């Protein structure tokens, strides 16, 4: 084996998932020909 | 009032509490406990027991 | 295993020598929750567990 | 699926055979067997019915230990006549200062939803009744009564009565 | 098991005998006995039915003390005819400025799930009805009606009606 | 005991008489009376049935004010034939661009638990049905249908249909 | 609409054919097949009934693993006789020190609400019964019994018995 | 009053006509129409039954997408025979490696509470069944079966089967 | 009698049992031929 043996339990309540992606933004990904809202 | 001789009255009859509870498979009381035991022995290790030399 | 034999001599093997995956992280925990009580005529006195961690 | 665990009768656990071989219906309806306690099941494999106008019944006495005015009384029955003696069935409440052998002239009747089919009748129901003596020094009797313009015939079946003054416990595997 | 403790009729505790020996069905359906109060049980051990087209009924008056438009009315019945007079049974609502002896020309009908078997009929049901006079200075009557192309025959049974304007208390051993 | 306060039909409060004296069953089943609204009770004291194979029915139109695909539709009926025309009863859904007088060739059928007894039939049930037009520019009709290999006979009774698009309020003394 | 998910019988998932071709009713009522376990379904496409007074029955043994005095026992049946042998059906409890072939002289009876129709009978019910041996060193048997003044006839159908000592799991899409 | 909103069948919304004119009962009971999906309603206005011992049935295939051992299966039926072919009805489970045209020699039966009346039969019930193949590489079929010592007669009606693997949504005005 | 007469009630809620063994570790007990996770 190598290197982990950590732990991960947290207290609280399981809040619902909010936003599929996004922790840190880079450059643009999509180009449609203008703004779209 | 309890019936019988003196020894029958002094001892507890658990049929006297049948109408107090609802019928379940776990009798009249149940418990779930962890026993944290620790003993200081003089025994060889598992390694010493399985190795000839 | 071969990586165990080399370790007993005091040596080392890389995971490329053995052709094995590399473990980067490992996590462990216990899962808990609470209970829900029934309140109608038949289920008054009955409980149901809900595990969420 | 789940199990129901709720019912309407809750019979007695002990059943008694009818010590009699015939009955004669009349306006003073005869009692089949001596009333007892607050619960009783009566079964009869063979009963001869003679010609007459009126009825007959099976009853129980009312327990007055608990001082509550209104209580629930249950019935479960299954009767089979050989002929079709067009008849109606009901619940009857009456009072008597001694052990009764017939029905007195003052009484009340109640409707219960049965399953008439011609010679056949089945029921399993409950009715709320005032059980206190309503007149000092008297006993109250509640019975299951059959009334018709009877002819000579035969019948078989069983009748069960219960007074809800205590609750019955049962095993529930999940609870 | 547990006891149900929920029902659909809740009869009256006092029953009355029919002071009559015959009825003649008609389009103006005759009332069997004088209406009263908000609850009434009527039993008859013998009633003669003459030949005629139409029906007859047993009704009660509606209590207007509580100002609520819609209320529940219950019925429990058990009738046995000697012949098979193919008939249908329903709940009828009508209005009158005085005590009625027949059915007026304006009325409503309602269906209730009974147990026709040929000469036999049983029911135990409840229906929501608008009970306020709907026209100033009038009384409202609700009854149980039987309608057919009748011939000469005979019947026996009992009929019970109830208007749910108050609740009935009963003994519950666990509560 | 307590009162039930839960039901399966909830009739209309206004009943209508059948303006007709005969019907002829056919594969294109005739409609008894003009459909209306989302609730209708029809009673008939006398109807003549002519010989024919097929059926006849009583229906209502579907209200499309609320944009909900599936809704509950109730029925309460009580029919009495003089003979025994072995027949089965069901719930039928069909569509038409104008007011219908018969049953079109495309339709669906549904089973409901009745109480056949020979000349007699009673039911009180509810069924979920898709009520939107399923094809642009059409109306949806739901009815109660009787089908058999009919002969010449007679019948009486009443039929009531209801579409659950609103809830009915009632008086509860404890609440 | 929603699905009920609550029932009264909960059959076994495995059914057995009757290895027999005739039965003779008697006061010592014969057992149709060898009792087994706490659940059993028996179906028979053809059974010959000989003339005799008394009855016959199908039973199961009681499981005593769980120390609970009172337990629920269910039944679901459907029988069809060719003639109309006026009969009544019940639930019977008895005890025996060995495997039984008839009914002993000491037993109890219980009423259950069936659907007699003349040659036809259907039931689906549950009854609470005391299941412990009540006398040391004995087994308890509970069965479904049919009793009449039988003549020579024929019958077909199936009988299913169940003892509620465990609960059955089912799929619920929303839970 | 309130609306029930809980039921036991939940039919399909699409019904199919029987493409056949006769059936011959046998110990290898014929299948009326090709099985399909997990839900199917079949209605027939005219079916000729030839003389024979055994039965016939209408079935559906079981969906195995969800890995749950036990599931609920519903039925709603209404049949009318011209004569009285004393018969019993049940639910049958069997297995086949190809599309079946008859009933194999290995199968199970289950009781359901119907309403036999003589030529008439009605039912609306649900039963829990193990739906997984129980033997690798096989399909599971569940049907509604009628069994008797049939003679030459005729019948009409409809049969509907449903497997509870999803839930049906309906409009509730208060929620 | 001898020596105890103590008491043991505690306040709170009966949390579910977590881990069958383990209060204080000693030496190794099981030898399979390598690591097993």
């Amino acid at each position: 084996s190598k290197g982990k043996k950590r732990s991960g339990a947290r207290p609280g309540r399981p809040q619902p998932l909010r936003g599929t992606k996004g922790k840190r933004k880079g450059a643009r990904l999509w180009y449609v020909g203008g703004q779209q809202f | 009032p309890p019936s019988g001789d003196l020894q029958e009255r002094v001892l507890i009859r658990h049929h006297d509490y049948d109408q107090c509870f609802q019928s379940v498979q776990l009798l009249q009381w149940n418990s779930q406990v962890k026993f944290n035991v620790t003993v200081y022995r003089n025994l060889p290790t598992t390694r010493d027991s399985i190795m000839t030399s | 295993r071969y990586r165990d034999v080399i370790s007993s001599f005091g040596g080392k093997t890389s995971y490329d020598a053995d052709n094995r995956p590399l473990l980067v992280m490992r996590s462990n925990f216990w899962a808990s929750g609470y209970d829900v009580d029934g309140t109608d005529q038949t289920s008054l006195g009955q409980f149901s567990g809900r595990v969420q961690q | 699926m789940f199990q129901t665990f709720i019912s309407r009768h809750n019979s007695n656990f002990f059943s008694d055979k009818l010590v009699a071989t015939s009955v004669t219906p009349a306006s003073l309806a005869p009692v089949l067997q001596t009333p007892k306690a607050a619960s009783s099941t009566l079964y009869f494999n063979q009963l001869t019915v003679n010609a007459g106008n009126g009825g007959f019944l099976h009853c129980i006495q009312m327990d007055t230990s608990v001082n509550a005015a209104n209580q629930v009384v249950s019935v479960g029955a299954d009767i089979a006549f050989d002929a079709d003696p067009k008849f109606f069935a009901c619940l009857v409440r009456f009072e008597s200062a001694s052990v009764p052998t017939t029905l007195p002239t003052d009484y009340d009747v109640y409707p219960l939803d049965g399953r008439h089919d011609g010679g056949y009748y089945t029921v399993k129901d409950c009715v709320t009744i005032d059980v206190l003596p309503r007149e000092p020094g008297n006993n109250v009797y509640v019975g299951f009564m059959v009334w018709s313009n009877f002819t000579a015939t035969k019948c078989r079946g069983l009748v069960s009565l219960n007074q809800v003054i205590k609750e019955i416990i049962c095993l529930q595997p999940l609870k």
Side-chain angles (χ1 to χ4, degrees), chain A residues 1 3 5-37, chain B, chain C, chain D:
Chain A
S1 178
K5 301 235 237 78
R6 186 177 181 170
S7 55
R10 298 290 183 277
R13 252 204 189 271
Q15 321 286 351
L17 303 188
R18 168 181 302 194
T20 177
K21 297 175 298 180
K23 184 185 193 301
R24 164 189 285 262
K25 172 71 195 306
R28 280 191 64 175
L29 297 180
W30 294 292
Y31 293 94
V32 189
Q35 58 177 349
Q36 207 184 44
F37 272 172
Chain B
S3 294
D5 47 285
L6 183 61
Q7 183 175 356
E8 282 295 306
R9 295 190 248 116
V10 175
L11 299 185
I12 304 178
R13 299 276 298 104
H14 73 85
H15 291 95
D16 293 358
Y17 313 101
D18 277 354
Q19 324 285 294
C20 186
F21 308 102
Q22 313 194 51
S23 287
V24 292
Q25 195 182 315
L26 284 185
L27 308 181
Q28 290 173 337
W29 63 265
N30 59 84
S31 189
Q32 295 92 30
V33 52
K34 182 187 185 177
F35 301 96
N36 305 279
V37 193
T38 302
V39 183
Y40 292 79
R41 301 209 205 271
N42 255 307
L43 280 185
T45 58
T46 307
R47 212 205 96 103
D48 299 338
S49 297
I50 54 173
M51 287 299 258
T52 298
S53 292
Chain C
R1 296 195 175 105
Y2 174 81
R3 85 180 87 115
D4 289 331
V5 182
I6 302 304
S7 184
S8 60
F9 287 89
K12 295 165 180 52
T13 58
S14 61
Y15 62 92
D16 286 312
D18 212 13
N19 208 82
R20 70 176 183 269
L22 178 67
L23 175 67
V24 188
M25 190 54 196
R26 194 216 167 141
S27 293
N28 188 261
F29 59 93
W30 296 89
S32 184
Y34 65 97
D35 283 328
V36 185
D37 314 336
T39 56
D40 77 322
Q41 187 190 5
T42 296
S43 71
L44 195 57
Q46 187 185 334
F47 311 89
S48 184
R50 189 196 192 188
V51 170
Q52 47 172 19
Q53 187 65 37
Chain D
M1 286 187 269
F2 300 103
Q3 188 71 35
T4 289
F5 284 139
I6 311 286
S7 180
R8 294 230 278 253
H9 185 20
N10 285 330
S11 295
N12 175 254
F13 295 166
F14 286 96
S15 56
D16 307 317
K17 208 202 207 322
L18 176 64
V19 189
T21 44
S22 61
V23 72
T24 305
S27 296
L28 307 169
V31 185
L32 285 180
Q33 208 155 272
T34 304
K36 69 185 193 67
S39 185
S40 177
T41 303
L42 180 82
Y43 76 92
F44 45 99
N45 290 335
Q46 204 48 306
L47 174 62
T48 294
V49 182
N50 303 123
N53 303 20
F56 53 91
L57 62 102
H58 164 67
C59 60
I60 58 176
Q61 196 183 333
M62 288 292 106
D63 191 357
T64 55
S65 304
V66 178
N67 190 36
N70 305 319
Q71 298 180 14
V72 181
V73 174
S74 298
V75 57
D78 193 338
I79 312 299
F81 291 93
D82 288 20
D84 189 3
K86 331 283 189 306
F87 70 99
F88 72 99
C90 64
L91 217 71
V92 50
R93 175 204 182 277
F94 63 101
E95 291 184 6
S96 179
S98 50
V99 172
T101 56
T102 53
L103 186 66
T105 50
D106 287 331
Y107 55 93
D108 295 312
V109 297
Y110 306 86
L112 62 80
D113 43 357
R115 293 178 179 83
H116 272 101
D117 203 79
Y120 289 113
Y121 183 79
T122 312
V123 67
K124 171 159 289 189
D125 204 17
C126 46
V127 173
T128 301
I129 283 181
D130 52 332
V131 300
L132 284 203
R134 192 196 268 175
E135 183 68 28
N138 273 18
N139 294 325
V140 183
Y141 299 91
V142 181
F144 173 82
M145 168 141 70
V146 164
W147 197 291
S148 177
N149 185 31
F150 279 103
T151 53
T153 172
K154 209 138 307 194
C155 70
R156 60 182 64 86
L158 52 93
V159 181
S160 181
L161 288 161
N162 187 65
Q163 171 189 348
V164 180
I165 199 177
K166 27 162 289 302
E167 206 89 353
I168 298 296
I169 216 58
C170 189
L171 167 79
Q172 298 185 49
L174 286 182
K175 172 151 62 183

Coordinates of all heavy atoms in Angstrom, one line a residue, chain D residues 51-94:
Chain D
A51 N -92.9 -24.7 13.8 CA -93.7 -23.6 13.2 C -94.1 -22.6 14.3 O -94.6 -23.0 15.4 CB -94.9 -24.2 12.5
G52 N -94.0 -21.4 13.9 CA -94.4 -20.3 14.8 C -94.0 -18.9 14.4 O -93.1 -18.8 13.6
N53 N -94.7 -17.9 14.8 CA -94.5 -16.5 14.5 C -93.7 -15.8 15.6 O -94.1 -16.0 16.8 CB -95.7 -15.7 14.2 CG -96.6 -16.4 13.1 OD1 -96.4 -17.5 12.8 ND2 -97.4 -15.6 12.5
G54 N -92.6 -15.2 15.3 CA -91.8 -14.6 16.3 C -90.3 -14.9 16.1 O -89.9 -15.0 14.9
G55 N -89.5 -15.1 17.1 CA -88.1 -15.4 16.9 C -87.5 -16.1 18.1 O -88.2 -16.6 18.9
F56 N -86.2 -16.2 18.1 CA -85.4 -16.7 19.1 C -84.0 -16.1 19.1 O -83.7 -15.4 18.1 CB -85.3 -18.3 19.0 CG -84.8 -18.7 17.7 CD1 -83.4 -18.9 17.5 CD2 -85.7 -19.0 16.7 CE1 -83.0 -19.4 16.3 CE2 -85.2 -19.5 15.5 CZ -83.9 -19.7 15.3
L57 N -83.3 -16.2 20.2 CA -82.0 -15.4 20.3 C -81.0 -16.1 21.2 O -81.3 -17.0 22.0 CB -82.4 -14.0 20.7 CG -83.0 -13.8 22.1 CD1 -82.0 -13.4 23.1 CD2 -84.2 -12.9 22.0
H58 N -79.8 -15.6 21.1 CA -78.7 -15.9 21.9 C -78.1 -14.6 22.5 O -77.8 -13.7 21.7 CB -77.6 -16.7 21.2 CG -76.3 -16.8 21.8 ND1 -76.1 -17.5 23.0 CD2 -75.1 -16.3 21.5 CE1 -74.8 -17.5 23.4 NE2 -74.2 -16.7 22.5
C59 N -77.9 -14.6 23.8 CA -77.6 -13.3 24.5 C -76.4 -13.5 25.5 O -76.1 -14.7 25.8 CB -78.8 -12.6 25.1 SG -79.6 -13.6 26.4
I60 N -75.9 -12.4 26.0 CA -74.9 -12.4 27.1 C -75.4 -11.3 28.1 O -76.1 -10.4 27.7 CB -73.5 -12.1 26.6 CG1 -73.4 -10.8 25.8 CG2 -73.0 -13.3 25.7 CD1 -72.1 -10.4 25.4
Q61 N -74.8 -11.4 29.3 CA -75.0 -10.3 30.3 C -74.0 -9.2 30.1 O -72.9 -9.4 29.5 CB -75.0 -10.9 31.7 CG -75.5 -10.0 32.7 CD -75.4 -10.6 34.1 OE1 -75.4 -11.8 34.3 NE2 -75.3 -9.8 35.1
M62 N -74.3 -8.1 30.6 CA -73.4 -6.9 30.5 C -72.6 -6.7 31.8 O -73.2 -6.8 32.9 CB -74.1 -5.6 30.2 CG -74.7 -5.6 28.8 SD -73.4 -5.4 27.5 CE -73.4 -7.0 26.8
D63 N -71.3 -6.5 31.7 CA -70.4 -6.3 32.9 C -70.5 -4.8 33.3 O -70.3 -3.9 32.4 CB -69.0 -6.7 32.6 CG -68.1 -6.7 33.8 OD1 -68.6 -6.4 34.9 OD2 -66.9 -7.1 33.6
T64 N -70.7 -4.5 34.5 CA -70.9 -3.2 35.0 C -69.7 -2.7 35.9 O -69.9 -1.8 36.7 CB -72.2 -3.0 35.8 OG1 -72.3 -4.0 36.8 CG2 -73.4 -3.2 34.8
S65 N -68.6 -3.4 35.8 CA -67.4 -3.0 36.7 C -66.9 -1.6 36.3 O -66.6 -0.9 37.2 CB -66.3 -4.0 36.5 OG -66.8 -5.3 36.8
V66 N -66.8 -1.3 35.1 CA -66.3 0.0 34.6 C -67.5 1.0 34.5 O -68.5 0.6 33.8 CB -65.5 -0.1 33.3 CG1 -65.1 1.2 32.8 CG2 -64.4 -1.1 33.5
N67 N -67.4 2.2 35.0 CA -68.5 3.2 35.0 C -68.3 4.0 33.8 O -68.0 5.2 33.8 CB -68.4 4.0 36.3 CG -69.6 4.9 36.5 OD1 -70.8 4.5 36.1 ND2 -69.5 6.1 37.0
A68 N -68.7 3.4 32.6 CA -68.7 4.1 31.4 C -70.1 3.9 30.7 O -70.5 2.7 30.6 CB -67.6 3.7 30.4
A69 N -70.7 4.9 30.3 CA -72.1 4.8 29.9 C -72.3 4.0 28.6 O -73.1 3.1 28.5 CB -72.7 6.2 29.7
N70 N -71.5 4.3 27.6 CA -71.6 3.7 26.2 C -70.4 2.8 25.9 O -69.3 3.3 26.1 CB -71.7 4.8 25.2 CG -72.9 5.8 25.5 OD1 -73.9 5.4 25.9 ND2 -72.6 7.1 25.3
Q71 N -70.7 1.6 25.4 CA -69.6 0.7 25.1 C -70.0 0.0 23.8 O -71.1 0.0 23.3 CB -69.4 -0.3 26.2 CG -69.0 0.3 27.5 CD -68.8 -0.8 28.6 OE1 -68.7 -1.9 28.3 NE2 -68.7 -0.3 29.8
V72 N -69.0 -0.6 23.1 CA -69.1 -1.3 21.9 C -69.3 -2.8 22.1 O -68.7 -3.4 23.0 CB -67.8 -1.1 21.0 CG1 -68.0 -1.7 19.7 CG2 -67.6 0.4 20.8
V73 N -70.2 -3.4 21.3 CA -70.6 -4.8 21.4 C -70.5 -5.4 20.0 O -71.1 -4.8 19.1 CB -71.9 -5.0 22.0 CG1 -72.3 -6.5 21.9 CG2 -72.0 -4.6 23.5
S74 N -69.8 -6.5 19.8 CA -69.5 -7.1 18.5 C -70.3 -8.4 18.4 O -70.7 -9.0 19.3 CB -68.0 -7.4 18.4 OG -67.3 -6.2 18.4
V75 N -70.4 -8.8 17.1 CA -71.1 -10.1 16.8 C -70.5 -10.7 15.5 O -70.0 -9.9 14.6 CB -72.6 -9.8 16.5 CG1 -72.8 -8.8 15.5 CG2 -73.3 -11.1 16.2
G76 N -70.4 -12.0 15.5 CA -70.0 -12.7 14.3 C -70.8 -14.0 14.2 O -70.8 -14.8 15.1
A77 N -71.5 -14.2 13.1 CA -72.5 -15.3 13.0 C -72.4 -15.9 11.6 O -71.9 -15.3 10.7 CB -73.9 -14.8 13.3
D78 N -73.0 -17.1 11.5 CA -73.1 -17.8 10.3 C -74.1 -18.9 10.4 O -73.9 -19.9 11.1 CB -71.7 -18.5 9.9 CG -71.7 -19.0 8.5 OD1 -72.7 -19.2 7.9 OD2 -70.5 -19.1 8.0
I79 N -75.3 -18.7 9.8 CA -76.4 -19.6 9.9 C -76.8 -20.1 8.6 O -76.7 -19.5 7.6 CB -77.6 -18.9 10.6 CG1 -77.2 -18.1 11.8 CG2 -78.7 -19.9 11.0 CD1 -76.6 -19.0 12.9
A80 N -77.3 -21.4 8.5 CA -77.8 -22.0 7.3 C -79.1 -22.8 7.6 O -79.1 -23.8 8.3 CB -76.7 -23.0 6.8
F81 N -80.2 -22.3 7.0 CA -81.5 -23.0 7.1 C -81.6 -23.9 5.9 O -81.1 -23.6 4.8 CB -82.6 -21.9 7.1 CG -82.7 -21.1 8.4 CD1 -82.1 -19.9 8.5 CD2 -83.5 -21.6 9.4 CE1 -82.2 -19.2 9.6 CE2 -83.6 -20.9 10.6 CZ -82.9 -19.6 10.7
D82 N -82.4 -24.9 6.0 CA -82.6 -25.9 4.9 C -83.6 -25.2 3.9 O -83.3 -25.3 2.7 CB -83.2 -27.2 5.4 CG -82.1 -28.0 6.1 OD1 -81.1 -27.4 6.5 OD2 -82.3 -29.2 6.2
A83 N -84.6 -24.6 4.4 CA -85.6 -23.9 3.5 C -85.2 -22.4 3.5 O -84.1 -22.1 3.8 CB -87.0 -24.1 4.1
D84 N -86.1 -21.6 2.9 CA -85.9 -20.2 2.9 C -87.0 -19.5 3.7 O -88.0 -19.1 3.2 CB -85.9 -19.6 1.5 CG -85.4 -18.2 1.4 OD1 -85.1 -17.6 2.4 OD2 -85.5 -17.6 0.2
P85 N -86.8 -19.4 5.0 CA -87.8 -18.7 5.9 C -87.5 -17.2 5.9 O -86.8 -16.8 6.8 CB -87.5 -19.3 7.2 CG -86.0 -19.8 7.2 CD -85.6 -19.7 5.8
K86 N -88.1 -16.4 5.0 CA -87.7 -15.0 4.8 C -87.7 -14.3 6.2 O -88.8 -14.1 6.8 CB -88.7 -14.3 3.9 CG -89.3 -15.2 2.8 CD -88.3 -15.4 1.7 CE -89.0 -16.1 0.5 NZ -89.7 -17.4 1.0
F87 N -86.5 -13.9 6.6 CA -86.3 -13.4 8.0 C -85.4 -12.2 8.0 O -84.7 -12.0 7.0 CB -85.8 -14.5 8.9 CG -84.4 -14.9 8.6 CD1 -83.3 -14.4 9.4 CD2 -84.1 -15.8 7.6 CE1 -82.0 -14.8 9.1 CE2 -82.8 -16.2 7.3 CZ -81.8 -15.7 8.1
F88 N -85.4 -11.5 9.1 CA -84.4 -10.4 9.3 C -83.8 -10.6 10.6 O -84.3 -11.2 11.6 CB -85.1 -9.0 9.2 CG -86.0 -8.6 10.3 CD1 -85.5 -7.8 11.3 CD2 -87.3 -9.1 10.4 CE1 -86.3 -7.5 12.4 CE2 -88.1 -8.7 11.5 CZ -87.6 -7.9 12.5
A89 N -82.5 -10.1 10.7 CA -81.7 -10.3 11.9 C -81.3 -8.9 12.4 O -81.1 -8.0 11.7 CB -80.4 -11.1 11.6
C90 N -81.1 -8.9 13.8 CA -80.9 -7.6 14.4 C -80.2 -7.8 15.7 O -79.9 -9.0 16.1 CB -82.1 -6.8 14.6 SG -83.4 -7.5 15.7
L91 N -79.9 -6.7 16.4 CA -79.3 -6.8 17.8 C -80.3 -6.2 18.7 O -80.9 -5.1 18.5 CB -78.0 -5.9 17.8 CG -76.9 -6.4 18.7 CD1 -76.2 -7.7 18.1 CD2 -75.8 -5.4 18.9
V92 N -80.6 -6.9 19.8 CA -81.6 -6.5 20.8 C -81.1 -6.3 22.2 O -80.2 -7.1 22.6 CB -82.7 -7.6 20.8 CG1 -82.1 -9.0 21.0 CG2 -83.8 -7.4 21.8
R93 N -81.6 -5.2 22.8 CA -81.2 -4.9 24.2 C -82.4 -4.9 25.1 O -83.4 -4.3 24.7 CB -80.5 -3.5 24.2 CG -80.1 -3.0 25.6 CD -80.0 -1.5 25.6 NE -79.6 -1.0 26.9 CZ -80.5 -0.8 27.9 NH1 -81.7 -1.0 27.8 NH2 -80.0 -0.3 29.0
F94 N -82.3 -5.6 26.2 CA -83.4 -5.7 27.1 C -82.9 -5.8 28.6 O -81.7 -5.9 28.8 CB -84.4 -6.8 26.8 CG -83.7 -8.2 26.9 CD1 -84.0 -9.0 28.0 CD2 -83.0 -8.6 25.8 CE1 -83.4 -10.2 28.0 CE2 -82.4 -9.9 25.9 CZ -82.6 -10.7 27.0

